[PDB]
Structures are given as C-alpha cells and as structure tokens.
Amino acid sequence: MSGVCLLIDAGNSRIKWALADTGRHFVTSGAFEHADDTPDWSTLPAPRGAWISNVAGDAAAARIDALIDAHWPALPRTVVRACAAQCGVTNGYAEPARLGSDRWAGLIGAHAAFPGEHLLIATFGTATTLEALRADGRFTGGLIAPGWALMMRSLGMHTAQLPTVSIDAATSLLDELAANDAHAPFAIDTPHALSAGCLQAQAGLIERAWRDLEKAWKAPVRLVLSGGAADAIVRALTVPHTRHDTLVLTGLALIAHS
C-alpha cells in the first residue's frame, strides 16, 4: 500500500506541490507555471490520492486533473475547501465555505506548527493575506491586500507616466529591497520610489495589524510570514517575526493524513 499523498496548492500565480508521507513531512516538492509547463512526476512513487487546493479558477482545475490522470489514472482525489471546522481549527468566517482554500490549509498548518500560541499569519503571494488564529484554533477573521508585485503592476497599468516593470525587472527590484538595511529612506528615482512605496505599504499593513491584534487579544501574538516577498519585507520590519514557508502544503498534508 502507498504511504504517500500528493498535495497541490494552486494559486493565482503558480502551482506548488508536494508528496507527503506524514502530516508534517515531505518526500519531495516543487512548483510550476499555469501554461507551457509540467512537473517531473514520472520518477515519483505512486500516491494513494491527491489533495488539491485551487483558488485559480476552473481552467486551472481542469489542467491539474489532466496532469494527475496523465500519471495515475483514476487516482482518488479531494478538492480541498474551507469548512466549519477541521484539524483543530474552527472557521469564524460568516460563511465558512467562502474562505480561500489556501488560507484554510495554511490555518491548519499553522495550528499544528505552533501549538498553544496566538498567531497572525501573513502570506505573500498574488495577494497578501492575513489571518488571526487563536491558540484554541479559532480563526477569527482576516484581511486581504494586493501583494507587492501586483501593487507594482497596478501603478504602471493605471497611470500614464509610471512604468509597468517587467516580471524580470520586478524580481530584480524586489531582490534589491531584500539587500536593504533597516529603516531605509525614501527614494530619489521612479523605479525605486515604486518598489519602496509598495514594500512600505506591505510592511505597514503587517505591523499595524499585528499591534492591533496584540492590543485586542491582550496576549503575545506570533507573527508568521510566508512567501517570496518575505525576504524583502523582513528587512523593513521592526517587529518580531517567524518564517514558515510550508504552512499551506503542511495543512494539506494534515487534511490528507486525517
């Protein structure tokens, strides 16, 4: 019998995956793009099923199915969705099912990773999302903002004079931010005014939300950060933080192995 589960985290920007033998451990993992790209799965040991989080729409769903079937015909699979309660977490959304499935899995991962702690989970992807998670597993609410790269693109696409920086140039500007010292000053050129402005908006959101949460809950809150833009955001942060970049896949592993 196979001891491994295939886990897929399809977001708006890319598709991440892992093969998990327990609720916490991955045998291997990787990522690919939505178009003209396919992962190396012909060397993988056959999984007992797939668990799929997809917030990228029906086209992506059909494409993921096509990839799974092209390797393991009729593999059992589960389309993961947020629900009222699962794996120690209870969903405080007014309509639990409307919470993003990625966010749900991340909550489950974080609950397991940091037992007994109040958390603010910050995940940097297409969007920047925040979730407040009590030590007793109650997800009490959250916030959504555009992510750094989306902010940058929005400015070029919706003003006459600001450049729409390319994917590669945006990556270069983000990497420059990740080389900055603390308390970076303002910029003296347009591309850096954009990069720093969008970064400071990210840092400002996270710090303001974290302080608000500690003050509301009257207890220490662990700020947990995830995602590509975290390296740059950490240079700007002054508040304590923890990095955990596998919360969503861990949550999927916990669901699969439950």
Ligand X SMILES: CC(C)(CO)[C@@H](O)C(=O)NCCC(=O)O
CA 233, CA 242: separation in Å to the nearest integer? 12
Q: Which of 58, 69, 102, 189 is catalytic?
A: 102
* 126 binding a second copy? (CB under 8 A): yes
* Binding-residue pattern over the window 134 to 173 for Cl ion, x denoting contact by CB under 5 A: xxx-----------------x-------------------
Concerning whether 102 is annotated as a catalytic residue, the answer is: yes
Residues within the interface to ligand X (CB under 6 A): 11-12, 55, 98-100, 102-103, 125, 127, 129, 144, 159, 161-162, 190, 193
Give the nearer residue to Cl ion in terms of CB position, either 39 or 191.
Answer: 191
Among the residue ranges 65-73, 92-100, 107-115, 240-248, the one whose residues contact a second copy (CB under 8 A): 92-100
Q: Is 102 annotated as a binding residue?
A: yes
* 162 binding a second copy? (CB under 8 A): yes
* 100 binding a second copy? (CB under 8 A): yes
Within 8 A by CB and 6+ apart from 72, the residues are 46, 47
Residue 161: CB minimum distance to K ion, A: 6
* 215 binding a second copy? (CB under 8 A): yes
> Residue 113: exposed, middle, or buried by beta-carbon count in 10 A (0-12, 13-18, 19+)?
buried
**Quick one: which of 45, 48, 38 has its CA closest to 70?**
38
Dihedrals phi, psi of 230, to nearest 5 degrees:
-60, -35
117, two tokens: 């702690």
Residue 190: CB minimum distance to ligand X, A: 4
- CA end-to-end span of the chain: 17
Give the nearer residue to Cl ion in terms of CB position, either 39 or 156.
Answer: 156
Give the nearer residue to K ion in terms of CB position, either 96 or 156.
Answer: 156
* 112 binding a second copy? (CB under 8 A): no
CA 244, CA 256: separation in Å to the nearest integer? 20
Q: Which of 80, 121, 155, 221 binds a second copy (CB under 8 A)?
A: 155
Q: Can you list the pairs that 216-222 forms with residues at least 24 positions away whose Cβ atoms lie under 8 Å?
A: 217/118, 217/134, 219/118, 220/117, 220/118, 221/118, 221/119, 221/120, 222/114, 222/117, 222/118, 222/119, 222/120
238, two tokens: 């002054």
* 29 binding a second copy? (CB under 8 A): no
CA 158, CA 168: separation in Å to the nearest integer? 20
Give the nearer residue to a second copy in terms of CB position, either 126 or 242.
Answer: 126
Q: Is 100 annotated as a binding residue?
A: yes
**Quick one: which of 90, 87, 49 has its CA closest to 68?**
49
Q: List interacting residues with Cl ion (CB under 5 A).
A: 134-136, 154
Catalytically active residues, by annotation: 102
Q: List interacting residues with K ion (CB under 5 A).
A: 156
